[PDB]
Write a protein that binds this ligand. Structure first.
Ligand SMILES: Nc1ncnc2c1ncn2[C@@H]1O[C@H](COP(=O)(O)OP(=O)(O)O)[C@@H](O)[C@H]1O
Ligand SMILES: [Mg+2]
Lengths: 51, 371, 51
């Protein structure tokens, strides 16, 4: 159907936009993982200085 | 057996069996009698189309919601809606299933008592329980603390909870919600020439609001930009053609949430009633409430609200506290998912209001220990 | 119709795939943000100890 055709096209476009946000969330995940590792290391050094 | 987790709401009735992920049947709660005369004989014309059937024949009906602001104003229509929900959208007789309705905070008692009396006398359920619409939305997030802003379509209420202990003196219920935003959008569309008046065209304005409107991060800058360029004007095709172009009406409709002076309401926006609700709490649980602010309800689905609200609260709150706004993608059905989780618990299985208890104490049992 | 049928099916599958991806990535971003914040609180504890 023509309207179902437009709807399916719009939904697939919405899927692709969700995939673009999937990319952005992947970037957030990776950078925050770097942050997690850096925090582990910095906390270790801070506790050592405490000792 | 399984429990029926119904959720009356105001604008969309969401129902389904306990223990699933999404409601089984979601349909608008409108009952519309026909208004014209009708000349074809034997067409099988009914006297009232309810639910999703009246959103297809809305051209010749006069739709009227049976729930105004949380409270129920037309009990016969609400009974009709419930009967439809049980028999045609789920096809399970209520004689063999417990029910778990939901109710906004600070609602009139008579509404709740009449609700339980109907459920026990007309539909004759085995046992029913009424729960506050915000605790469920807190269940669904998997938290146990946090202050939840459940901006539905009827009424926006803001219940803070800590460690499972609700704070009854800090509930701030405000009656601005999606319906008032629909009316305000329908009122500001007249500034371009488009006039929607009929109760059927309110649905078209609602669709415009859902598909186009968004919340501006900064209001004055957007007002200045929309008045110079034309990068915002998005067009939309009515149910008959004649496309319309929405200019700066896009972010002015949902801005009413943060400035209720637009529709003449005195109170402060949803950005400041949350901060006031927090400040009424004790001084030692304010950090946790700041960090676990939860959004729920349909009207909090505007694109860009989880950033505007965070910016506003960060402006109001002390600079040291961290402000975090939980906005799950399944916001609309958050209350119902929480209701399913609560009904699926074993510890909760003895809190239902059993029918023999109602027979002994009357409908006023709901205010008693079985809350 | 058959063309519309295939279009509809493919768009629906793409939409569901994008939704699942973005939802799981949202869960991941939640987890990594939790990592960051809890590490920050460790940082504050260490700062107080050292001072
Ligand atoms: N995607 C959306 N974008 C903007 N507004 C929405 C969206 N979906 C629903 N709404 C608004 O929310 C209302 C539905 O809210 P809902 O959570 O169903 O209320 P209730 O608490 O009664 O169930 C609708 O009337 C509509 O105005
Ligand atoms: Mg609700």
């Amino acid at each position: 159907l023509k309207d179902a055709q437009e709807k399916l096209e719009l939904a697939e476009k919405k899927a692709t936009d969700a995939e673009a946000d999937v990319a952005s969330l992947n970037r957030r995940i990776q950078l925050v993982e770097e942050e997690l590792d850096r925090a582990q290391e910095r906390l270790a050094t801070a506790l050592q200085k405490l000792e | 057996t399984t429990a029926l987790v119904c959720d009356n709401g105001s604008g969309l009735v969401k129902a389904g069996f306990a223990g699933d992920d999404a409601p089984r049947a979601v349909f608008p709660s409108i009952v519309g009698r026909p208004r014209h005369q009708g000349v074809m004989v034997g067409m099988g014309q009914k006297d009232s189309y309810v639910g999703d059937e009246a959103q297809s024949k809305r051209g010749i009906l006069t739709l009227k919601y049976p729930i105004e602001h949380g409270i129920i104003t037309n009990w016969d229509d609400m009974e009709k809606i419930w009967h439809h929900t049980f028999y045609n959208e789920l096809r399970v007789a209520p004689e063999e299933h417990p029910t778990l309705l939901t109710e906004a905070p600070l609602n009139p008692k008579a509404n709740r008592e009449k609700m339980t009396q109907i459920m026990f006398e007309t539909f004759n359920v085995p046992a029913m329980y009424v729960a506050i619409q915000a605790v469920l939305s807190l269940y669904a997030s998997g938290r146990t603390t946090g202050i939840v802003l459940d901006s539905g379509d009827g009424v926006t209420h803001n219940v803070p909870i800590y460690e499972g202990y609700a704070l009854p003196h800090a509930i701030m219920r405000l009656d601005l919600a999606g319906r008032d935003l629909t009316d305000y959008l329908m009122k500001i569309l007249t500034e371009r020439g488009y006039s929607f008046v009929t109760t059927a065209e309110r649905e078209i304005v609602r669709d415009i609001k859902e598909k186009l409107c968004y919340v501006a991060l900064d209001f004055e800058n957007e007002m200045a930009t929309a008045a110079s360029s034309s990068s915002l004007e998005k067009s939309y095709e009515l149910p008959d053609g004649q496309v319309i172009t929405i200019g700066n009406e896009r972010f002015r409709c949902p801005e009413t949430l943060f400035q209720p002076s637009f529709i003449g309401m005195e109170s402060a926006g949803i950005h400041e009633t949350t901060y006031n609700s927090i400040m009424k709490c004790d001084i030692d649980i304010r950090k946790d409430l700041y960090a676990n602010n939860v959004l729920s309800g349909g009207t909090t689905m505007y694109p860009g609200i989880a950033d505007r609200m965070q910016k506003e609260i960060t402006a109001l709150a002390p600079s040291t506290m961290k402000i975090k706004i939980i906005a799950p993608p399944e916001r609309k059905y958050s209350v119902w998912i929480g209701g399913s989780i609560l009904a699926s618990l074993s510890t909760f299985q003895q809190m239902w209001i059993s029918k023999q208890e109602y027979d002994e104490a009357g409908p006023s049992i709901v205010h008693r220990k079985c809350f």
